[PDB]
């Protein structure tokens, strides 16, 4: 891979998609592509807007 958060499950904490589950489909740089679970669409979102799941709860981009 070319990053450590691809394909990992994510929760969105800002924006119109707040509270929605997703998966990091592509994280080239700063602007990520999260594949939302709820409707069949992959959205552009800033990496600042995401919580990643880790060993203990949803951590911000410090994982």
């Amino acid at each position: 891979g070319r990053d450590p958060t691809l394909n990992k499950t994510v929760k969105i904490r800002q924006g119109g998609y707040k509270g929605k589950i997703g998966i990091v489909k592509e994280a080239n740089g700063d602007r990520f592509r999260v594949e939302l679970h709820n409707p069949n669409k992959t959205i552009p979102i800033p990496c600042s807007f995401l919580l990643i799941e880790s060993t203990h709860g949803w951590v911000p981009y410090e994982d």
Partner: protein, 263 residues
Amino acid sequence: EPKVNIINAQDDEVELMLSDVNLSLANSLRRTMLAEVPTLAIDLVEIKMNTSVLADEFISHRLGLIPLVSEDVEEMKYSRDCTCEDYCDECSVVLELSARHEGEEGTTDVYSSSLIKVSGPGNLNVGEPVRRDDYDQGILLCKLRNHQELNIRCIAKKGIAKEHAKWSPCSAIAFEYDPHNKLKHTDFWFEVDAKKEWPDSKYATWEEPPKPGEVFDYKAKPNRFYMTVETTGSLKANQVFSRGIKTLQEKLANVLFELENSR
């Protein structure tokens, strides 16, 4: 200058005659009541377990259409102006449901009254689903046969009737004006007679019938209006009306603010 004359008033519907105003103010009031009365409704569903004979989004749809009580919904903030992460307490109401069948003979009916409010910002009057009486069971969500557990957890957020037709408070609103046809704003189809081939609108006695020796005036305008408002229990009609007028006033005040600060 405006006037009001309530003809029928009760719990969840009003029938009134709105008089001595303009037209697009009453019409804009109607559209405002059908389009912008911010209410509350279920928004997210996280199904923990489903083993019934119904696909998920079918259930999540039916839950998506359930009326909840929202008297104090003009204080809770929207979902986009809370600075927390995921959700907190000043932005949603959390419900949970858990039902199972037990035995070999039987067909348990999972209703809507079995929804239990868990956590919400207090102490405000939200969350609880609308109940008709003191015994009534309400909406019929699902059915369960032998060994079919169902357990789910739902989020509930605030919205208006422009983002989805579920946050809408009123059903249908009756509206009319000028029953005897005096302004000649319309024309009537007929085969033999245009009088013995049409119904009489329930209000053709409140105004007087025109004289057959009358000429045609040409300065009058639609003046006396007749409207009737229903609800689904999520609100009560007087609150719908007052909140509508309040929202319209806030809109005009916003536009005036833009015009003033744009200087």
